[PDB]
Each structure stands twice: as C-alpha cells, then as structure tokens.
Amino acid sequence: PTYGVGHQPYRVVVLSFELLHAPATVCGPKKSTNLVKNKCVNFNFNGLTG
Amino acid sequence: VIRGNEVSQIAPGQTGNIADYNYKLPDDFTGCVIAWNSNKLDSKPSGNY
Amino acid sequence: YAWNRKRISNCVADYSVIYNFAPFFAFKCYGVSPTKLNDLCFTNVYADSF
C-alpha cells in the first residue's frame, strides 16, 4: 500500500462485442412493435435502422 | 489484474510485455475496456503474491 | 528556472526500464511512440529535470 499511483494494482474488465451475422441473443430493453407491410415506415431490425 | 503502468498496453495495436506475453488484443477490436484502481482490496501490508 | 540538462551519449539505451524507476502513468511522446523507441535510434539524447 506504500507504493505510488503508477505501481498500484488495477482491476481490468474487457468487454468484447461480436458483430457477426449470427442471430442476435444479447439485446437491450427496448420494446417491440407490431409489423406493418406495404407502407413507407421506419424500421429497426436488431439495431439496423432505415 | 495488472499494474498501473500496463493499463495503456491493453489496447489494439500496442506492444510491450503484457501485450506480447500475457494478453494480446486484435487490431480490429470492437469493444470496451474498463479499468479501476483496487489498492484497498488487492494489496497487503505483507505483500499480495 | 534553473533546470538541469544531462547529456546521454555513447551507450545502449533500454527504454523498458524507465517504468521501474518512477511511478508514473504513461509517456507523453511527440513525434514518436513510446513502444517503438527500441527499433530505431538517435544521435544525442538529453534529459531535463524540474
């Protein structure tokens, strides 16, 4: 405990995100909306907006 | 758990001792690195070995 | 106002032992990178302490 701030221990947690084309299994708390077709709308398919 | 000088080595493209022999990150890394001090929990007066 | 200047010449420089002498966080390097200081070399190196 008597060392300086450059030699003190640090805890490191590294989060790695997988941007593959697999079906998504880790997704946030946003709710879903019923699907509508043949109408110019805005969509959000697993984070892909348009 | 690493030292304070080696936090900058946990990054894409970095080299050194931890980045070469302990933990290497890819150059196309997409993610987050979280680091905080743990001097009260991971230290001992007689030594944390 | 009276900063020192030490001339370093005619020696082999190892920059990986700097981290053991002083408890700092990281280098602040301009023009070069702190991890690439061993694969290239200079003519004269100074050191100013204040």
Curated annotation (Swiss-Prot), chain A:
Residues 21-43 are annotated as: Disordered. It comes from the Viruses. Attaches the virion to the cell membrane by interacting with host receptor, initiating the infection. The major receptor is host ACE2. When S2/S2' has been cleaved, binding to the receptor triggers direct fusion at the cell membrane. When S2/S2' has not been cleaved, binding to the receptor results in internalization of the virus by endocytosis using host TFRC and GRM2 and leading to fusion of the virion membrane with the host endosomal membrane. Alternatively, may use NRP1/NRP2 and integrin as entry receptors. Binds to host ACE2. RBD also interacts with the N-linked glycan on 'Asn-90' of ACE2. Cleavage of S generates a polybasic C-terminal sequence on S1 that binds to host Neuropilin-1 (NRP1) and Neuropilin-2 (NRP2) receptors. Interacts with host integrin alpha-5/beta-1 (ITGA5:ITGB1) and with ACE2 in complex with integrin alpha-5/beta-1 (ITGA5:ITGB1). May interact via cytoplasmic c-terminus with M protein. May interact (via N-terminus) with host bilirubin and biliverdin, thereby preventing antibody binding to the SARS-CoV-2 spike NTD via an allosteric mechanism. This is Spike protein S1. The chain holds residues 499 to 548 of 1273 of the full protein.
Curated annotation (Swiss-Prot), chain B:
Binds to host ACE2. RBD also interacts with the N-linked glycan on 'Asn-90' of ACE2. Cleavage of S generates a polybasic C-terminal sequence on S1 that binds to host Neuropilin-1 (NRP1) and Neuropilin-2 (NRP2) receptors. Interacts with host integrin alpha-5/beta-1 (ITGA5:ITGB1) and with ACE2 in complex with integrin alpha-5/beta-1 (ITGA5:ITGB1). May interact via cytoplasmic c-terminus with M protein. May interact (via N-terminus) with host bilirubin and biliverdin, thereby preventing antibody binding to the SARS-CoV-2 spike NTD via an allosteric mechanism. The gene is S. It comes from the Viruses. This is Spike protein S1. Attaches the virion to the cell membrane by interacting with host receptor, initiating the infection. The major receptor is host ACE2. When S2/S2' has been cleaved, binding to the receptor triggers direct fusion at the cell membrane. When S2/S2' has not been cleaved, binding to the receptor results in internalization of the virus by endocytosis using host TFRC and GRM2 and leading to fusion of the virion membrane with the host endosomal membrane. Alternatively, may use NRP1/NRP2 and integrin as entry receptors. The chain holds residues 401 to 449 of 1273 of the full protein. Changing K44T: In strain: Omicron/BQ.1.1. Residues 3-5 are annotated as: Integrin-binding motif.
